[PDB]
Structure formats: C-alpha cells, structure tokens
Design a binder for this molecule. Structure first.
Ligand code: HEM
Ligand code: HEM
Ligand code: HEM
Ligand code: HEM
Lengths: 249, 140, 144, 145, 141, 245
C-alpha cells in the first residue's frame, strides 16, 4: 500500500525530501557500520589456532619437566637438595592450569564473536531492505506532490532534489521523521519506520560488543603467553639439574 | 588527457547506451563480483545473488553517475566532487578496485555494442573510465 | 583453479573462436589502447593509425601465433607453469616485458571475446576466462 | 633468491634493527602515506593525525608482531612459501587484503631502514632487502596465486 | 591533488637537498638499476658500472628537472611539458617504471635527511613524486 | 686540451650554443637508435632452437616413413599399394633436404645478427662518450665567452640556454658544425668531432642491417615450416599404406 496522507504545504514537502534522502542514506550507513566487525570475525579462526598452540607448547614444556623429574626420582628420596628439582616442575604444572584456563576463554569469545557478527549482518540487511523500500513510497508521495492542485506545493516538490544523505545515523533519521508526524504514523510505513530505528540501534549494539569481545580475547592470549613464558623458564630451569645429574644412589 | 576526438567517441558510445544504462551498470557489477570476488567485501549488507534488485538498484546509481560524468566531460572533477569524497573518506575503497569495475564496464559495452565498440572507441572509453577513476581516487 | 563446470563453458566457447583472426584483433587492440607497447614491435612497419595497425599483416600474423599459445594453455589448464615455460625465458630473461603488459593483453582478449560472442559471453563465462588469462599471465611471468 | 654475499649483508643489518620499535615505524608510516589501509585498523583507536598514529600503542604493538614475521622469514629465505603459509590464510581468504598493500608496506619498511641506517643502507644492501620484501609479499599472496 | 601543507613540505625537504641535488639523483638511479635490473634496458649505450660519470651526469639532469618541478609546483604540467613528450613519444618508457624511480628517490631522501623525512613529509614527498610521474605519463595516448 | 679559438661575435656564440645542445642530444639519439636492434637480437636464440626442433620433427617424419618403406619392401615394383609408399617416402626425404637447407640459413643469420648487434652497441657507446666529452669543451668555451670584453658576446653567451636537442641526427649535427668552421677544425676536438659523424653513420648502417638479417631469417623459418608440413603429410601418407599391408 501507498501513503494516503498528502503533502499539505511547502515546508512539509521539504521535510519529505530530506526524509527520502535520509532513508536512501540508510543503505550506505549500515554498510560502513557492519564492515569493521566482519574484519574482526575473519581473525577469530587464526586467533583460536594460536591458543591451541600456546596450549601445545605448554603441554610439551610440562612433558619436558615431567621427564626431567622422573630421572631424579631415584637419586635423592625425601632428601634436602632434590626438594628444589621438584619445585620448578610444580611451578610448571601450575602455570599450565592457567594456560588451559585462558584458552577456554579464547574459545568462548571466538563463539561469541561469530554469533554476534552473524547476528549484526542480519540487522544491517534488515535496516537496508526496510530503508530502500520505504524511500520508494516517500518518492511516490513527492511525485504526486509535483502534480498537486496547490501552486506552492507544486513548486516545492519541483525544486526538491533526488539525493542521498551520506551522514545518516539512528538519531538523524528519527529527527527527520519527527518533522512529519503524519507520515511517521501512517499505517503504510509506520511499522517499516519503527523496524529501521530498532535494526540500526541493534546493529550498533552488536558492532561495539564485537570490539569488546575481541579486547577480552586479546587479553586472554597475552595472559596465556605470560604463563607460557613462566612455564617454559621453570621447565628449562630446574630441568637444568636433570642434565648435571647422571649419578647413581 | 581526453582529446576532442576521444570526447566525441565517449558521448557517441554512451549516447547508444541510453535507455539500457541501468541494466548495463547492474551487469558490470555482477561481472565484477564474479571475476574479482574480494570486491564483494565492501557490500556485506547487500543481497549479491543473481539478478538481485539491490544490485539492479545500485547498478542504475553507478550508471547515472557516469551519464552525469559524460555530460560534464570538460569539468569532470567538480561533477563527481561528491563521490570522490564518499569513496575516499566514508567507504575507504582500495584504489586498485576502481581498475576492476572500469574493465567490467568495458566488458559490458563490448558485449552489447558490437558496431560502436571499435579499436578507436575501445581506446577512448578506457581513456575516459581511467579519468573517472582518477577523480574518485583524488581525495585519499 | 577452474571448476569442472567452468572448464566445460571455456573449452565450449574457444572451439567457436576464429583462430585465424581473433588473435590479431587482440594484439592490434593492445597497440591501439596501450601505445607504449609498440616499442617491442618497431619492425612491424606501419603503426601510425588504428586502421594502419589493424590492417598490418605482421600484426594479424603474430596475433595468430600468440593465440596459438592461448589455445595450448586452454588445453593444459592443470599445468600452465610448464606449458608457458619456454616462452617465460623469451618474455622475461631476453625481452624483459613488464608482467603487467601480459595482464593488459589478457584483459584485451577478454574484451575481444565479449565483442564477438556478445550475450554468449555471460558474467560466469567471463569469470572463468578471467581465471585462465590470469593464469597465462602468471605462467609467463614465472621466471620473475 | 639471494646470493651468499647478499645473505651476508642482509642478516648483518637485521641484527642491528631495534625489533621493539622499527615495526611500528613501518606500520604507522603505511597508515599515514596510504590512508585507505586504515579500514583494516578501525579498532586501533586514534588515527586522525600522523602524531596520533605514530603515538598509538596498538600500532607500535601490532608493528612488533608484523616485524617478527619479517625476522622469521629472513631466516628461512630458501622456504618463504611455507613460513608465511598460516598468515596467507588470514590475509587472503579471511581478511581479503589486496596483495599490492603487502608490496606497499614492504617498500615502506625499506624506507624506514634507509631512514634509520643511512649511509649503512647502501644501494647493493637496498637491492637485497628489495628481493626479501618481494619474497615476503609473494609468500603472503600465495593463497591467490 | 597537493595541499598547501603538502606543498610546504616538498619545498622545505627539497630546500634541504640544495647543492646535493645531482648527488641524490645519481644515487636514486644507481639504487633503481640494482633493485629493478629491468630498468637498465633503456640505457644500453650507457656505462652503468659503480660510480660512473655517465650515471653521475644523468643524475644531475634528472634532479634539476625535479628542482624546476618544485619551483613550479602550482603549474607542474607546463613546467615538464618538454619531458612528458620526450619520455612518451621518443623514449617510450613503460609507465610502470616511473613508480620504481619515484621509490628509489624516497629511499635516497630517507638515508640523507634523518630529521626531514618524518611521516608527515614521507606522505607529502610520495604524493608529489606521483604527481611528477602523472605529468610524464600524460602524453602516452 | 681546451679549444684555443675564441668566440668573435654574437652570431658565433649562438651557433656554439646550438652545437652544444646538438652534442648533448647525441646520447638520446644513439639510445633510441640502438634499442630496437637489441630487441631483435633477443629473439635470435629462441628462433634458433625453434629451427632445431623443425629439423628434429623432420628427421622423425623421415624415420617414420623410412620404417614404413622397410615393411612394404617385400613386394615388386608393380603394385599401386607398394609404389605409393616408396613414392611418398621419396617426397618425404626431398622435403627434408630443404628443411636441412633453411636451418643452415637460420644458423648463419643468427650469428650475423649477434655480431652486428654486439658491434652497433660499441658504436652507440662510442658516439655518446665522444658526443658528451666534446660538449664539455664547448660549454667551457661558452663559459669563457660569458667573461668576454665585448658587450655583445658577453650578452649572447648569457642569453644562451643549457639545453638538449631531442631531434639530433648525423645530418643535423654535421650542419651545426658547418656553422663554426674554426671550432670544427680546432685540433683539440677536430678528430673527436669526426669520430662522432662516423660512429653515428655506422650505428645506423648496423641497426638497418639487423632489420634486414631478421626478415631473411623469419623467411627461412617459414620455408622450413612449409617443407615440414610437406614432409609430415607425405610421411603420415606412407604410414596409411603401411598399416594396410
Ligand atoms: C566507475 C566508478 C564508480 C562510480 C561512478 C561509483 C558510484 C557510486 C555511487 C554513485 C554510490 C552511492 C550513491 C548513492 O547510493 O546515492 C557508490 C556507492 C558505493 N560504491 Fe561506488 N562507484 C564507483 C566505483 C566503486 C568501486 C570500484 C567500488 C568498490 C568495489 C565501489 C563501492 C561502493 C560502495 C561499497 C558503495 C556504498 C553504497 C551502499 O552501500 O549502498 N564503487 N558508488
Ligand atoms: C600475455 C600473453 C602473451 C603470449 C601468449 C605471448 C606469446 C608470444 C609468442 C607465442 C611469441 C613467439 C611468436 C613467434 O614464434 O614468432 C611471442 C613473441 C613475442 N612477444 Fe609475446 N606473448 C604474450 C605477451 C607479450 C606482451 C605483453 C608483449 C609486449 C608488449 C610481448 C612481446 C613479444 C615480443 C617482442 C615477441 C617477439 C616476437 C617477434 O617480434 O618476432 N608479448 N609472443
Ligand atoms: C606484507 C607484510 C605483512 C606481514 C608480515 C603481516 C603480518 C601479520 C601478522 C603476523 C598479523 C597477526 C599477528 C597477531 O595477531 O599475533 C597480521 C595481522 C593483520 N594484518 Fe598483516 N601483515 C602484513 C601486511 C598487511 C597489510 C598490508 C595489511 C593491510 C592493511 C594487513 C592487515 C592485517 C590485519 C587487518 C591484521 C589483523 C589485526 C587484528 O588482529 O585485529 N597486514 N599481520
Ligand atoms: C620520474 C621522474 C623523471 C624525471 C624528472 C626524468 C628526467 C629526465 C630528463 C630531464 C631527461 C632528459 C635528459 C636530457 O635533457 O638530456 C630524461 C631522459 C631519460 N629518462 Fe628520464 N626522468 C624521469 C623518469 C624516467 C624513468 C622512470 C625512466 C626509465 C624507465 C627514464 C628513462 C630515461 C631515459 C632512457 C632517458 C634518456 C637518457 C639518455 O639516453 O641520454 N626516466 N630523464
């Protein structure tokens, strides 16, 4: 269905013209909004593999210390000097339980980003489709106003340009819709206009939350790296005692 | 720099484009996404399926830009001053992509204008589409 | 790099190209659109105007031998690196043809095929020939 | 590939580069000279002016991780294809980064090394680093062809 | 399009080059032939050996052209109208080569101007050298 | 040594200015002259190893017919079936004698082009080295004229521009040298000047002769190809009658 309420005056026509331009500019806006969050979802595959590795290097640093502590099991039993060669291996396994902890975080964040991005795409296509559709109905309303039995309305619709607003936001659009409450609330577009405002607002809420989960994910990979350094240098540390001792008890 | 002879050929060839401008633009873009799939990334919020109306819509917007550019061949930088900024500062399209669409536009015109797409015209159209690309890349 | 459905449309269209002349139409078009490319063919004689370039029997002639190389790569799609290996030595080690020029000629061929076949040179078949000409460009610039 | 005399000058100069900062100087310079590359780093924060970019801790940080890849591939010159293989998947099939941008960053690194070493970055050593950066560009764009 | 800010940086950086113009030119060319050996083909009749006087000579001719281009930044196409024709119709240099010398000129200026070649200036010099290349490539069709 | 004869008047200074520009433009000229003949020398090895394979394909087409004539040997000189093989094989070996003949031509032309190009490079280097060395001596002569007590000579040398003549030829240069017979015959440059005129003339004589040896070459490879087609279709013809028994 088309918009039944006609453009009463020259000032009303001018608002509808800016509205046809705002609704057109929704197409550009969502694209620019969604795009960086898609770049972030592209790195989740790579950043997960980095975590499975820090775990692999961790498990291996644990196994190098677990073999080094096995060699010095039957050399000093409940003695004084060998109480130290077991301490670094304890530091090594404790550091791993932290590596294994942060890797679980990276995993959950990867799944969160995927789910958020897949979601935001639907909000950007949804805002786009409802954008372009409603602008058609507004253009037709202006096209009728170019025929209007009123000379001031006929000239305002004529002077009025077919343009696209490049700086559209959820705010600027609601502001353009406030100018024409009769169009804003007309049954032919009423829900479509309401569907854009929500879709745009949810799309920004998602893009921001993707930047957020990434910040949490990068923190975990740095913390997994800190503990891998702590594990390796505790492995190679008291495991140094394993090369110096070849003796028999 | 477009010669009076180059200018005549453009105007004449785009003159033959006429009524079908919108269908052509849509084909140029569809050819671009298929041949160079990394171009699709700038449209994540678009329905890029075969014969989409989003692509049909965008197609006309790209062609009417070119129809305006032809009309204002002598003062092309001011004619497209709007887009040269939109592309540079808002979309941040890599300049290497302007070369790809320009070629798909030539592929479109070759397939549809058997008579007019002659070697003399092929040169003048590529000369022109390079000039259009230069304008759009001018604000980086 | 090509899908069996693409390999099907590609070898289909190629069996319909006039081998005798489509080569000279691409090679001539290169020397007309990108004139600096004439520095390699100064012995070709008359190259002053597009009608003097298109008319040149040497251009149409060499055009046939160049397309013949394309007809070979279009048979040997699985192994392009080796097919064009001997030519890579001539175009890179001896003549030093900047690889973009190969790319330019490649796109010009695609333009000629579109000009000839028309509505038969559909976006997906263009997409497949693009893969081919990109391959033939890489296979030739392999020595770099 | 490189000559044993070039491999000698290359690994010489590289052992003198401040790994901690020369990476951020190249990455920052890329986003300053070729601004469109910024679409790839909108989460980095403030990038509005060259001094905001150069100052950006995220830029200097990420700069160190990209130079680390350069330090990696400079060791295995005989096998660059495999060294950068994991990264090729990220830059090509995931991010969809145009290969010329790798080339642009490569030339920017060469500009940074010249800016830092001066008369030590002689025409023949420039020539050798050029071969290296060309290789690292190809190895990364391997997933395209 | 070079901004008033870009223009100031060029003039300032090439102002610091001064007498060393024919020095940095010979360097830029020597760097170009070594990095991109494909470029040597346009000079078959030249002695391209290390520290050649032919290359030293050509170097000054290339730099004084650039010194003129800086002086006439606002009207660069007419300033180099002579060369844009020489390169295009007489030499037939492939345009892809103008990109290569332009980079080697930046490599030269980075090595010699430690203070001057800042990120702000690096951008403005590359924008300028691209504009010089654009002028020289303008008569190829 | 430097030029001893001083510039007498404003018209003399003007000729020396153009002659300098001419001598400068010699480097450009030789480069543009030599370059295409170098592109032609680059295709010699490709074309030789192309001729080598036409001979190999020829010899093989001969051996396929030589084996096909050995099988049909067990027959008299009466059967149409037995005689068509023997006759096609004769056509096949005769065609090879001309493949083998044209390949000798290709070989000699390849050696001729190499020798010509290697030669022309030295001419082009010699003309530029001598063309640029003498221009130095002429510039110094103009530099001394910028000091002259004549008000007219000092001003003419001052107005005089440091340029490079892009359309230099052997003709245009000799013509510029004719304007100043005192400079042309000065012992400091006299022979250097004569060395440019000869070097330039020999460089054009070589570049043209390279364009000629290549047409005479390409003709031979086409004629070797025509006879390879004539051999193969007479050889495959002999193989048609050999499987028939
Ligand atoms: C032949 C040159 C081109 C012209 C004339 C052109 C024209 C334009 C126009 C007129 C618009 C938006 C106008 C509107 O909707 O009101 C625009 C938008 C856009 N262009 Fe271009 N363009 C060109 C090349 C490029 C290239 C090479 C790309 C990248 C592959 C690009 C990607 C975009 C994108 C992403 C949009 C955003 C529009 C949206 O999201 O709805 N176009 N095009
Ligand atoms: C891109 C695909 C290309 C193919 C398939 C190709 C093919 C070949 C072939 C088959 C020949 C040898 C012809 C013969 O036997 O006489 C050759 C020769 C040659 N090609 Fe290419 N070529 C390509 C691109 C280039 C380009 C871009 C140029 C430079 C503009 C180049 C310049 C040459 C030259 C100078 C020769 C020597 C031919 C002669 O003068 O006799 N071609 N071409
Ligand atoms: C050619 C040399 C290059 C190398 C060696 C390289 C290396 C890498 C490395 C090692 C990382 C990830 C490191 C980590 O997260 O731990 C990566 C990430 C990235 N690279 Fe590259 N890169 C190069 C050039 C490019 C260029 C030219 C771009 C395009 C602008 C590109 C865009 C990116 C992006 C967007 C990321 C992801 C940043 C993030 O994780 O949020 N880089 N680089
Ligand atoms: C980008 C800035 C460039 C400038 C300012 C420049 C400047 C010039 C000038 C002024 C000359 C003429 C010298 C004279 O008057 O005798 C010239 C000659 C020449 N240029 Fe360029 N040029 C540039 C780029 C190129 C490039 C990229 C190439 C190589 C592909 C090229 C190759 C040549 C050659 C071969 C000559 C002739 C030299 C001779 O034979 O004596 N230059 N250059």
């Amino acid at each position: 269905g088309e918009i039944k309420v006609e453009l009463e005056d020259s000032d009303d026509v001018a608002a509808a013209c800016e509205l046809r331009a705002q609704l057109a500019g929704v197409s550009i806006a969502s694209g620019i909004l969604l795009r960086p969050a898609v770049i972030r979802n592209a790195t989740t595959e790579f950043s997960r593999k980095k975590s499975e590795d820090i775990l692999a290097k961790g498990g291996a640093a644990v196994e190098r210390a677990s073999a080094a502590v096995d060699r010095v099991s039957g050399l000093d039993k409940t003695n004084e000097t060998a109480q130290k060669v077991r301490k670094a291996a304890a530091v090594a396994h404790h550091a791993l339980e932290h590596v294994k902890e942060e890797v679980e975080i990276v995993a959950k964040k990867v799944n969160e980003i995927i789910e958020l991005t897949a979601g935001a795409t639907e909000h950007a296509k949804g805002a786009k489709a409802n954008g372009d559709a409603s602008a058609v109905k507004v253009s037709n309303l202006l096209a009728r106003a170019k025929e209007s039995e009123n000379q001031y309305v006929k000239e305002a619709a004529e002077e009025c340009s077919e343009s696209t607003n490049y700086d559209v936001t959820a705010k600027s659009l609601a502001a353009a819709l406030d100018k024409l409450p009769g169009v804003k609330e007309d049954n032919a577009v009423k829900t479509t206009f309401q569907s854009i405002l929500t879709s745009l607002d949810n799309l920004d809420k998602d893009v921001k939350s993707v930047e957020q989960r990434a910040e949490e994910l990068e923190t975990a990979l740095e913390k997994a790296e800190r503990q891998l350094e702590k594990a390796e240098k505790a492995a190679e540390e008291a495991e140094t005692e394993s090369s110096k001792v070849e003796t028999e008890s | 720099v477009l010669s009076p002879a180059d200018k005549t050929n453009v105007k004449a060839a785009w003159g033959k484009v006429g009524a079908h401008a919108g269908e052509y633009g849509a084909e140029a873009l569809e050819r671009m996404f298929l041949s160079f799939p990394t171009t699709k990334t700038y449209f994540p919020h678009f329905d890029l399926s075969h014969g989409s109306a989003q692509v049909k819509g965008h197609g006309k917007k790209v062609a009417d830009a070119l129809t305006n550019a032809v009309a204002h061949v002598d003062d092309m930088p001011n004619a497209l001053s709007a887009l040269s900024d939109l592309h540079a500062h808002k979309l941040r399209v890599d300049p290497v992509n302007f070369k790809l669409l320009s070629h798909c536009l030539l592929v479109t015109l070759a397939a549809h204008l058997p008579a007019e797409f002659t070697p003399a015209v092929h040169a003048s159209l590529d000369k022109f589409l390079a000039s259009v690309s230069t304008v759009l890349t001018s604000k980086y | 790099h090509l899908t069996p459905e693409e390999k099907s449309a590609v070898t289909a269209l190629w069996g319909k190209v006039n081998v005798d002349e489509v080569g000279g139409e691409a090679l001539g078009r290169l020397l007309v659109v990108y004139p600096w490319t004439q520095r390699f063919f100064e012995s070709f004689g008359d190259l002053s105007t597009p009608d003097a370039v298109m008319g040149n029997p040497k251009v149409k002639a060499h055009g046939k031998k160049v397309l013949g190389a394309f007809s070979d790569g279009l048979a040997h799609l699985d192994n392009l690196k080796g097919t064009f290996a001997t030519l890579s030595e001539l175009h890179c080690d001896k003549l030093h043809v900047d690889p973009e020029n190969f790319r330019l000629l490649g796109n010009v061929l695609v333009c000629v095929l579109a000009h000839h076949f028309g509505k038969e040179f559909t976006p997906p078949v263009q997409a497949a020939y693009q893969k081919v000409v990109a391959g033939v460009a890489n296979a030739l610039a392999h020595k770099y």
